[PDB]
Amino acid sequence: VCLLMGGSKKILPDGMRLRGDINVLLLGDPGTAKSQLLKFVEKVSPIA
Amino acid sequence: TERVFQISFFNLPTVHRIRDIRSEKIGSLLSISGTVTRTSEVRPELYKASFTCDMCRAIVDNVEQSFKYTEPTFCPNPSCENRAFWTLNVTRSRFLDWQKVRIQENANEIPTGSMPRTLDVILRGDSVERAKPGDRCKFTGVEIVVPDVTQLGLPGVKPSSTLDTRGISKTTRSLGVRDLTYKISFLACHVISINERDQEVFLNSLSSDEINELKEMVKDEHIYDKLVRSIAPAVFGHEAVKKGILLQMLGGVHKSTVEGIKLRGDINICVVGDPSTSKSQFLKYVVGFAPRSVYTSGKASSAAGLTAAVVRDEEGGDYTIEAGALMLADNGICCIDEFDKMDISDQVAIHEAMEQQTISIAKAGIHATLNARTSILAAANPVGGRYNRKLSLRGNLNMTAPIMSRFDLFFVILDDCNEKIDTELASHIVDLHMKRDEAIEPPFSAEQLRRYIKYARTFKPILTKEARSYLVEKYKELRKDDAQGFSRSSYRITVRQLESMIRLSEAIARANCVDEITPSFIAEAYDLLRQSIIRV
Amino acid sequence: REELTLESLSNVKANSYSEWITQPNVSRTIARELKSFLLEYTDETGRSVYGARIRTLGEMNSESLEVNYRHLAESKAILALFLAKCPEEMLKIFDLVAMEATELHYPDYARIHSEIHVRISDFPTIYSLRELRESNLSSLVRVTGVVTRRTGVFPQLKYVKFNCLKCGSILGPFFQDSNEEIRISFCTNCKSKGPFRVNGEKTVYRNYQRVTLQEAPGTVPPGRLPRHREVILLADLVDVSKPGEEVEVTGIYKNNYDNAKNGFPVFATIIEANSIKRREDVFSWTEEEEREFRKISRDRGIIDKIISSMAPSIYGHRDIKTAVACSLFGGVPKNVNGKHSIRGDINVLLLGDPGTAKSQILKYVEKTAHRAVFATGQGASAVGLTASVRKDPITKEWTLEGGALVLADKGVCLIDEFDKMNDQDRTSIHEAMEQQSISISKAGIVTTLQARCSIIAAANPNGGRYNSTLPLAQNVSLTEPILSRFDILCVVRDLVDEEADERLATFVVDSHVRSHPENDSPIPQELLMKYIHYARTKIYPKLHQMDMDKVSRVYADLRRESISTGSFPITVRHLESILRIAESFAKMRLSEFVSSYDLDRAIKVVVDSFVDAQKVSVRRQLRRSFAIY
Numbered sequence A: 001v002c003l004l005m006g007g008s009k010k011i012l013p014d015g016m017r018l019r020g021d022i023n024v025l026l027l028g029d030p031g032t033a034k035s036q037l038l039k040f041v042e043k044v045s046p047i048a
Numbered sequence B: 001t002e003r004v005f006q007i008s009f010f011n012l013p014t015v016h017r018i019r020d021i022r023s024e025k026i027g028s029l030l031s032i033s034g035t036v037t038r039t040s041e042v043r044p045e046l047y048k049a050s051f052t053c054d055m056c057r058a059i060v061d062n063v064e065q066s067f068k069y070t071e072p073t074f075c076p077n078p079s080c081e082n083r084a085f086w087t088l089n090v091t092r093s094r095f096l097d098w099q100k101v102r103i104q105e106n107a108n109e110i111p112t113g114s115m116p117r118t119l120d121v122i123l124r125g126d127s128v129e130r131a132k133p134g135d136r137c138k139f140t141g142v143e144i145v146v147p148d149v150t151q152l153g154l155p156g157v158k159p160s161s162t163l164d165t166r167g168i169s170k171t172t173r174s175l176g177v178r179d180l181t182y183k184i185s186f187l188a189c190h191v192i193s194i195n196e197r198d199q200e201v202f203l204n205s206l207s208s209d210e211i212n213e214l215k216e217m218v219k220d221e222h223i224y225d226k227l228v229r230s231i232a233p234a235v236f237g238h239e240a241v242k243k244g245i246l247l248q249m250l251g252g253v254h255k256s257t258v259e260g261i262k263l264r265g266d267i268n269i270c271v272v273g274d275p276s277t278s279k280s281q282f283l284k285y286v287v288g289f290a291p292r293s294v295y296t297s298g299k300a301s302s303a304a305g306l307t308a309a310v311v312r313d314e315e316g317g318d319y320t321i322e323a324g325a326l327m328l329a330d331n332g333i334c335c336i337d338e339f340d341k342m343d344i345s346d347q348v349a350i351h352e353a354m355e356q357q358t359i360s361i362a363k364a365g366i367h368a369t370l371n372a373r374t375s376i377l378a379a380a381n382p383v384g385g386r387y388n389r390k391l392s393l394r395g396n397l398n399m400t401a402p403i404m405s406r407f408d409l410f411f412v413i414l415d416d417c418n419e420k421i422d423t424e425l426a427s428h429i430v431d432l433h434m435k436r437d438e439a440i441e442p443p444f445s446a447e448q449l450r451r452y453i454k455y456a457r458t459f460k461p462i463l464t465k466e467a468r469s470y471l472v473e474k475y476k477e478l479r480k481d482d483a484q485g486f487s488r489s490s491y492r493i494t495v496r497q498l499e500s501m502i503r504l505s506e507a508i509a510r511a512n513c514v515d516e517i518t519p520s521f522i523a524e525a526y527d528l529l530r531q532s533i534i535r536v
Numbered sequence C: 001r002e003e004l005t006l007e008s009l010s011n012v013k014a015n016s017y018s019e020w021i022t023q024p025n026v027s028r029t030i031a032r033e034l035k036s037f038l039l040e041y042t043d044e045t046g047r048s049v050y051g052a053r054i055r056t057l058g059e060m061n062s063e064s065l066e067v068n069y070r071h072l073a074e075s076k077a078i079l080a081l082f083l084a085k086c087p088e089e090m091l092k093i094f095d096l097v098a099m100e101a102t103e104l105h106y107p108d109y110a111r112i113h114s115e116i117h118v119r120i121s122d123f124p125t126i127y128s129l130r131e132l133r134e135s136n137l138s139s140l141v142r143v144t145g146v147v148t149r150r151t152g153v154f155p156q157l158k159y160v161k162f163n164c165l166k167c168g169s170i171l172g173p174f175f176q177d178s179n180e181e182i183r184i185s186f187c188t189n190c191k192s193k194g195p196f197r198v199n200g201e202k203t204v205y206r207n208y209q210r211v212t213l214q215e216a217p218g219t220v221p222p223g224r225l226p227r228h229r230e231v232i233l234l235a236d237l238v239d240v241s242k243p244g245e246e247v248e249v250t251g252i253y254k255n256n257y258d259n260a261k262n263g264f265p266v267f268a269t270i271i272e273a274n275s276i277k278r279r280e281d282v283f284s285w286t287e288e289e290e291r292e293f294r295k296i297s298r299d300r301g302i303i304d305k306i307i308s309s310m311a312p313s314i315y316g317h318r319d320i321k322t323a324v325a326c327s328l329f330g331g332v333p334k335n336v337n338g339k340h341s342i343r344g345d346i347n348v349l350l351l352g353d354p355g356t357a358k359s360q361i362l363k364y365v366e367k368t369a370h371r372a373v374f375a376t377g378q379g380a381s382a383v384g385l386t387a388s389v390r391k392d393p394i395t396k397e398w399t400l401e402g403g404a405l406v407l408a409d410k411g412v413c414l415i416d417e418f419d420k421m422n423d424q425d426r427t428s429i430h431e432a433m434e435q436q437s438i439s440i441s442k443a444g445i446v447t448t449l450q451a452r453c454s455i456i457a458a459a460n461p462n463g464g465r466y467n468s469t470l471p472l473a474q475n476v477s478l479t480e481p482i483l484s485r486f487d488i489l490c491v492v493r494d495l496v497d498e499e500a501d502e503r504l505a506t507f508v509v510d511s512h513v514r515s516h517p518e519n520d521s522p523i524p525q526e527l528l529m530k531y532i533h534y535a536r537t538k539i540y541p542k543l544h545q546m547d548m549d550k551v552s553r554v555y556a557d558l559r560r561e562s563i564s565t566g567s568f569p570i571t572v573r574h575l576e577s578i579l580r581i582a583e584s585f586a587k588m589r590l591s592e593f594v595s596s597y598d599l600d601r602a603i604k605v606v607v608d609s610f611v612d613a614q615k616v617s618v619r620r621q622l623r624r625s626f627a628i629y
Ligand SMILES: Nc1ncnc2c1ncn2[C@@H]1O[C@H](COP(=O)(O)OP(=O)(O)OP(O)(O)=S)[C@@H](O)[C@H]1O
Pocket: A028, A029, A030, A031, A032, A033, A034, A035, A036, A037, C342, C480, C481, C484, C572, C573, C576
């Protein structure tokens, strides 16, 4: 949910862009639904 | 209408090479020889054209087309007085059969450092399809010239023709300039080479004295042993390899199932071993004795040279299939020396022909399925340049497993520092150098041995009922011998060995010239196969 | 004089048969006499075969009349000889004759089809493509061969209406044929001879196709290369002979007229096909056949009958055949709410030593499966396993080739040599097994093709022989991610038993004996193939909560004996493979719900596959842990 929302981007006066998107890693045992939650995120995101 | 007659001269006093062809002999009868590489499909050639005039819609026939498209000059009706406007109507025309053969120089006729020359021979009439790729044929006919526009840009003063502009009565741009550049071609009226599956038709057309000697050879008791001793007389002491070569040159029978598995009866042999063990002297012997045999090397071959290629002679010209080594050796033997040196892709290409005995080329708009019914006699060297006795046959050979499976026999030849054997090999090598053919003493000459093999290839061996059970028992014995625990066979046994045994038994039955496979033949095949496996 | 009879037809007053037939005095005689031949000829039993053929033609709105050559030859020998002599002037009179005969029975038929095409069949003289010479030109030949290429379907001018650019006038229909294009120089309204353009909108067209017919490689004499010809299919035969099909083409052998490349006036030849037929739909069923399927399904032990039916020249390998049947019938895909997706395909791996018949169980699946695509890790590259946008170098146009997994979108993909594959093929197969789709962004094309295929793979162990002491993961080149996607793993090793080896050799020598060139309870193949197609198309089984309890417990047991061993993880993927194989077991019985016995069989298959993929030390789960199942 947080990754789909993501944080707010900042464009500093320096041109220093601060990122708002969230990156989430799932290290896990095989058969733990990691791919199925990736496929669902692909389906539910507007662009994915 | 009228029968066209073909006068076919032959038996000329002399035979010319491709490089002996010179421009003095244009339009003259003469004989050449060459190895056929490519043959055209028979095509219709306009011989007596019929023409319709646009003014007078009459029909002028029997317009002889000598060598090129030629419209008539005078109309049949006197009123028209037209000469330049005509139409060819194809149904009302007459045609001949035309095939264009391509012939290369024979391997023994190429000069030092030069490359083989190629010539386009034109077969016409009843001589079409009398030459097929791979065969060395001699042609009798006319040395002709055909237009060759590719001579543009060549050095020298190329000839040209201009219309004579005198006696023409100008009034005060009519060029008519043509290029007289030609190339030498050949028009053959006679082809002779320099379907046998039925036995009786083969024996019927064969000289009586040869029947005398063939039936004497069949009447002989140790005919198998004499045949083996007559295989590769120059090589000394490798008798298992000679047995295998003889059986390969005889072959089994091709059997097709109900659904079309199409079991193949061609014995494939691989010869591996230590350096200088005569492995390439057996491949040398096979090519030059076995009919339709093609010899090639691992590093001098490509996937498009072994199997058929899609080539183009002229830019802006169409594409053609020139026949590969696996097709020039069709119904024969392909002797591939240094199989290990050959690239992986070429090995996969040869695998495509070992599985289905067919090659599929789908390149450039040609989607042809060619058949390559060939036995592959391969010579290979183990990795590291020397056989490892304490390593498996697979570990010794870089040859891929899909290729290795289709080889029925693996003859591993190892040399040893045996006092007597070395003294006797060396006597043979030096006597083979001192004398030329007196040092070779085979029980049968190549002529009658080839005749016997040609006769024995016509049989369909059948195995009797006890042969089936003993084949089962021998397969069981091979399986029991394998995976024993201490035998450590070089390559392990499966149902491919059982099929190898059946076809080897059929080859042995052909060697003995009997239509029934005696169980002793299965025993001999079992021994020959079993002795091939080397314990680690 | 101006009208002849059948007896007087033989005497030819012209130089050749073409002028004889073109002569109106002979043309009307031939037309009348063929009109008589269509009407009178009847079979020995009494059936007027051409009567029934006309009724069938009228009742199916077809424009092809299947005229035989026995009947013409026996009834009117001189006309059959004329047809075999000049089949261009004939089949033009007789097409009109057939049109008249079908208009008599079916009046007002010209409004439907302009003309009836006649398909001469059972021609006696069968030629070979290498035997065709100039003497066969302009005549009717009957060759046989395999189709190797087809060039689309193109319209060809048949009834040309030409627009006058001076008036704007549309000149009437002018019949154009396969000889050459026609042209008009005379107007009517303004009598202009200037530019006259074909009007595409008002012109009538016919289908046209070129098929390359190449000699069957088996029939070619040794040392000779197969010969090919170009067969022209016109307006009714288009798209009936796929490449690789062995057909018998009856047609007219003629010259393609268009000489200086050869130095000789040499013409190419074509065969304008009259009738094309396969010499020897398949998966379609009738109502009677559907009833037969539904009745044979009700018999008990049908699953074992189907299992034994598969691969009837492959000895033993009964677990392999069970897995092959399960994959052939397959499960059923499921979407919860468009949010969770589960594949309904059973991927089966065959890990075996050399000479274990793995390739033969792949060719049999290609035999029996509808929409089955065969590919290899290395070798004959009929299909590439990878979707690519490739520019064809001869036709100048790009093509988006879906991979072997795309071509068999709803069927089976059979991969041989799955142990050895390129990284590209490995990635393609892995991502089409994970997502059931093929994503491609090449040459401006960005699309996700569908690859909802069931994968049957054949592999060789890593080294040459299976090692029971080592686990399956390190006995073969491919690694954890790809092996997990395989629902069933059939591990077969080359055993060392006296009895098995004896009986396999008895089977092979019997097959060799049967196959000699001299005379020296399984469901039938075609019935089974139609049965499998019907079951896949019509049967979508389900389960019910009544069978939840046992399955859950089994899953738990599988887990606990697996971590105690610790060698192989059995995850939720194994429960979902049990479910899929249960759906397949119900499918082969034509059932709509999954019975508990189907669940038991699926559990048995899954546990057997998982157990046989373990080590000998880990194999205890078979003897005393999972012996209950
Ligand atoms: N907690 C769970 N709830 C529901 N289904 C699950 C659960 N865990 C696994 N599955 C199912 O298990 C099957 C395989 O799980 P995957 O999503 O492929 O696991 P994974 O951990 O991503 O595997 P890898 O690491 O990619 S090999 C899917 O069909 C999931 O629906």
